[PDB]
Design a binder for this molecule. Structure first.
Ligand SMILES: Nc1ncnc2c1ncn2[C@@H]1O[C@H](COP(=O)(O)OP(=O)(O)OP(=O)(O)O)C[C@H]1O
Ligand SMILES: [Mg+2]
Ligand SMILES: [Zn+2]
Lengths: 34, 99, 48, 122, 76, 86, 97, 166, 89, 50
RNA sequence: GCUCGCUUCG
């Protein structure tokens, strides 16, 4: 779940070679870096 | 490739690019031309103050797609970064606190 | 009520004092003793 | 954050009362929103200590009265702790000096107590 | 009073950097900037107007020191 | 090949040999009692210099009653060099 | 990392450091080689001079003398490797003043 | 109450430069030393005065103004024989719970020295008859952080007589 | 002058550099890392951070360049402020 | 450089102090002469001399 | 992802 909005729309979307699991609703970066 | 020579005296850094060069005499000697593609990736952290507030507001409103703009916002109170590609950028611009 | 403890100090390193450690100091600094020569478990998870 | 001396100089309750009143008036004349929101324990401790001192008879004191009391007690060879306690408590009854005040033996003399009461009441 | 009265380029760079870092952190401006969104430009304007409230503390090798004001030093 | 060990050896491994019991007699007991007497009598000796207490809270009338008094030996300054005179 | 296929960054070699030294830009060199590359915050105990974790020193079994310190991560790796080599670096910290 | 000399390195951010330096230093010191107990010193109340204030450096790091300030601050630390007047903010079977007026609920008098009619039967009964006085006896402090309060003190109530209240 | 300041012509090689310099970190980083490090551990030689190489390694601003001097803030202040008088003492 | 395939690096400082030090000490206008002998290096070149 | 080798580039 997202720590800010509590949503479950956590998508793994890499932004320019940066692995990043981020919430799809508010854009809160859950996890980043591999 | 040891620690002293490869990791202490000389080490790799981020926020840098490498590109082939081409001549351009229409620019001053103290100026250098940067491609739009590299400029959108290499970012500079500007602190929100009383002077550049209205400029950073427009930069956030433009977003990470238009060239004049930003990519991330770090709040003063909490250090949780916010990506500008998601969420309402206008609300974030209207809530730009000093610092 | 509440005890006063400093949060953070702007500490700057002055100099590095090189030296050696006795086996007792090696035991005191270390947390666990390594005695198994194998690396992972026999199960398919291969946990250390 | 080290301290130089934790027992540099003992002070009575009147100096603390004056300092608390001065800090309170400077705060109410220079109240800041973010500074107060950062730490509210300051206001609490100051107000509660001022209220505790107000509950005590520490009021109606002045530096001249303290100096006169000290000069009067200097002739009684009493220690600094005894005069400090007498100033902080302001005993109106003799029994407070007879039993509560330490070092009672050989110090009361059954005649100096009246002078001590007359000085503390003046 | 024995050192060079001219303000060196290293002192200039460090003073401008410190002033830009301060202004970027919501420091008061003393030159009444006119649409300058870059803190370094504001720092250079303050240096040219000689209104930077910074005093350089030049240290001698033995241990002695001396204080020089930005407005007191000579700029080029 | 030697077997693998799951847990480290005990911090104090057991031994099948025990220390020999101490010698007994009037002499050993007398020496023990004399050593205890020396321990008890040498701390109160003026040669046993204690750490000087400092940071007194207040001065009081009871100071003269609680004042620690102890005789101090006078060193022979003829044999001792001049650098140790107070 | 190193390569573009590995999405690596550029390397400020020894000669680049020499040029930055010759220019005298101490803050720029510090930002490039420490802040922007391998910045980290370690915990050093002011009593034994060893590295602690989460504001705690396992060597002395105390946490009163443990203080935070900014450091390149490669320097901490070097210190740990030297401690592995019985060459123990003891850091005597002090106030910045 | 006693004065304590302290030397502190205060960091003032650049957005407080328009304020007077001494006022902001005093405010920061009061915010840092309010309702806190310094070990082997006692509970500090507030700042009394600022004696020495040397030059204000600016570090190449944070960029704020770092000043080493010598000051004297008031703390609450009895001299092992001081007499206090508190109020009973509770009572336990092993001892009453007296609190100095809105100051600190840390005074725990042991009930082992009064006349031999001492007991607390959990019904808030103070003492069987034949503004509460207090005689501080010893100070004691302890640490807090020990893994990856601090001032209680003992209180005596001798046979003071107390013609006003038993 | 650098080659002839100790009274003897010392070369730029590792031997002359060791005879001139004193910093352990720089001697280790240049050449003979393990030998110099073990010798320093044996001697217990404390190495300061005065040099440039150790400043770069430890991540602190070097003493050369802009870091030779220190800056002070021209803040509105009053050194040695008036002290509150003590009435009881 | 000779513009025959040279790859050059471009770094962006992340600090105001570093930016100011770079602009002042390493400014192109402030380094028109080499410290070796004071001769100016930034000058006219081919197709500018002719 | 670590290593090594070849290869190019200026
Ligand atoms: N091994 C190397 N080390 C450093 N720089 C190199 C190296 N190889 C190539 N370069 C770069 O390429 C440049 C060499 O060009 P240069 O030798 O002056 O012309 P050239 O290659 O002889 O061309 P012509 O044959 O004269 O047409 C200078 C240098 O920055
Ligand atoms: Mg080429
Ligand atoms: Zn330790």
């Amino acid at each position: 779940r997202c720590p800010d909005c509590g949503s479950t729309e956590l998508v793994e979307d890499s932004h320019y070679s940066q692995s990043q699991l981020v919430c799809s609703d508010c854009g809160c970066v859950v996890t980043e870096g591999v | 490739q040891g620690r002293f020579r490869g990791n202490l005296s000389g080490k790799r850094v981020d926020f840098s690019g490498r590109t082939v060069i081409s001549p351009d005499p229409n620019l001053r000697i103290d100026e250098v031309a940067v491609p739009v593609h590299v400029a959108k990736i290499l970012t500079f952290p500007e602190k929100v103050n009383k002077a550049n507030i209205n400029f950073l507001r427009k930069l956030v409103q433009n977003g990470p797609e238009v060239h004049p703009g930003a990519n991330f916002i770090q709040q003063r109170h909490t250090q949780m970064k916010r990506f500008l590609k998601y969420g309402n950028r206008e609300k974030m611009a209207q809530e730009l606190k000093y610092g | 009520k509440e005890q006063f403890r400093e949060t953070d100090v702007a500490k700057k390193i002055s100099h590095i004092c090189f030296g050696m450690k006795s086996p007792e100091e090696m035991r005191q600094q270390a947390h666990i003793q390594v005695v198994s020569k194998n690396l992972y478990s026999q199960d398919n998870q291969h946990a250390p | 954050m080290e301290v130089k001396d934790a027992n540099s100089a003992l002070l009575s309750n009147y100096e603390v009362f004056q300092l608390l009143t001065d800090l309170k008036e400077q705060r109410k004349e220079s109240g800041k929103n973010k500074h107060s929101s950062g730490q509210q324990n300051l206001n609490t401790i100051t107000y509660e200590t001022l209220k505790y001192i107000s509950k005590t008879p520490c009021r109606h004191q002045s530096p001249e009265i303290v100096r006169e009391f000290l000069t009067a007690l200097k002739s009684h060879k009493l220690t600094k702790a005894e005069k400090l306690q007498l100033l902080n408590h302001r005993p109106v009854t003799a029994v407070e000096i007879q039993l509560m005040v330490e070092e009672s033996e050989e110090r009361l003399t059954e005649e100096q107590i009246e002078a001590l009461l007359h000085t503390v009441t003046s | 009073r024995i050192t060079t009265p001219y303000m060196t380029k290293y002192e200039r760079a460090r003073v401008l950097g410190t002033r830009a870092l301060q202004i970027a952190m919501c420091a008061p401006v003393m030159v009444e900037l006119e649409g300058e969104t870059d803190p370094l430009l504001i720092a250079m304007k303050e240096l040219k107007a000689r209104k930077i409230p910074i005093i350089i503390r030049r240290y001698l090798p033995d241990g002695s020191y001396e204080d020089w004001g930005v407005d007191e030093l000579i700029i080029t | 090949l030697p077997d693998v060990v799951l847990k480290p050896p005990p911090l104090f491994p057991d031994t099948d040999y025990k220390p020999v019991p101490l010698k007994t007699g009037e002499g050993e007991e007398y020496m023990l009692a004399l050593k205890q007497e020396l321990r008890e009598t040498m701390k109160r000796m003026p040669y046993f210099i204690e750490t000087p207490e400092e940071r007194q809270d207040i001065e009081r009338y009871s100071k003269r009653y609680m004042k620690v008094y102890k005789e101090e030996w006078i060193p022979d300054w003829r044999r001792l060099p001049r650098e140790m005179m107070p | 990392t190193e390569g573009r296929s590995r999405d690596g960054g550029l390397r400020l070699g020894e000669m680049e450091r020499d040029c930055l030294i010759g220019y005298g830009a101490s803050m720029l060199l510090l930002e490039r080689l420490m802040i922007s590359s391998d910045a980290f915050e370690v915990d050093v105990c002011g009593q034994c001079g060893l590295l602690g974790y989460s504001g705690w020193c396992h060597y002395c079994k105390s946490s009163c003398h443990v203080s935070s310190l900014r450091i390149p991560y490669a320097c901490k790796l070097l210190f740990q490797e030297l401690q592995s080599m019985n060459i123990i670096p003891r850091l005597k910290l002090s106030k910045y003043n | 109450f006693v004065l304590v000399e302290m030397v502190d390195t205060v960091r003032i951010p650049p957005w407080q430069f328009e304020r007077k330096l001494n006022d902001s230093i005093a405010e920061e010191l009061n915010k840092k030393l309010a309702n806190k107990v310094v070990y082997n010193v006692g509970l500090c109340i507030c700042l009394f005065d600022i004696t020495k204030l040397e030059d204000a450096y600016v570090f190449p790091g944070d960029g704020a103004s770092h000043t080493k300030v010598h000051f004297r601050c008031v703390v609450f630390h009895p001299f092992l024989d001081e007499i206090l007047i508190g109020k009973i903010k509770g009572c336990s079977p092993e001892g009453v719970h007296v609190s100095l007026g809105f100051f600190d609920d840390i005074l725990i008098p042991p009930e082992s020295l009064q006349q031999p009619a001492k007991f607390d039967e959990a019904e808030q009964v103070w003492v069987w008859e034949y503004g509460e006085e207090i005689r501080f006896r010893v100070v004691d402090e302890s640490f807090v952080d020990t893994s990856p309060y601090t001032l209680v003190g003992s209180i005596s109530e001798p046979g003071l007589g107390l013609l006003s209240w038993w | 002058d650098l080659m002839t300041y100790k009274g003897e012509v010392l070369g730029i090689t590792r031997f002359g550099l060791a005879k001139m310099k004193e910093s352990v970190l720089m001697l280790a980083s240049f050449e003979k890392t393990a030998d110099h490090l073990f010798d320093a551990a044996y001697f217990g030689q404390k190495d300061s951070v005065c040099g440039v190489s150790e400043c770069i390694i430890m991540g602190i601003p070097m003493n050369i360049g802009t870091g030779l001097f220190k800056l002070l803030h021209k803040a509105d202040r009053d050194p040695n402020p008036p002290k509150r008088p003590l009435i009881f003492d | 450089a000779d513009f025959d395939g040279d790859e050059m690096n471009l770094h962006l400082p992340q600090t105001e102090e570093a930016k100011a030090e770079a602009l002042v000490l390493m400014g192109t206008k402030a380094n028109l002469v080499t410290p070796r002998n004071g001769e100016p290096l930034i000058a006219a070149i081919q197709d500018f001399l002719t």
